[PDB]
């Protein structure tokens with residue numbers, strides 16, 4: 001994946017509070033996270049992909065190789081087992097913790113980067129555009 005490379009700003013978000021709630025995010029965290037308009041910076045150095053998220057809420061960063069499981073501390077402080085693959089141009093990211101699972105799909109659509117977050121019956125869609 002490298003059509004994903006760049007700096008991306010959040011411009012729209014749907015159902016993100018519902019999603020965080022379903023994931024188990026406490027109210028105090030949802031409040032600040034929900035108002036957040038993060039900048040997402042994606043870069044690639046060989047087989048290592050780095051995704052940063054910067055906002056007044058929290059700075060986070062993951063570095064990974066496609067198809068190799070890694071430990072992630074999420075923005076909401078979950079300790080999860082993450083695996084990311086590239087599937088028909090789609091970056092598919094699964095987080096597993098406590099017998100639960102959530103999926104984040106990042107895809108390129110026109111000049112948008114579209115992020116779909118799924119937890120149980122809840123689907124949240126977030127759109128980023130180049131900074």
Ligand SMILES: O=C(O)CCCn1c2ccccc2c2ccccc21
Pocket residue numbers: 020023025033036038053055057074075076104115117126
């Ligand atoms: O990438 C996204 O836009 C949503 C998935 C990752 N993510 C955040 C990104 C920016 C700000 C807060 C959060 C957040 C909060 C809880 C869980 C996942 C989260």
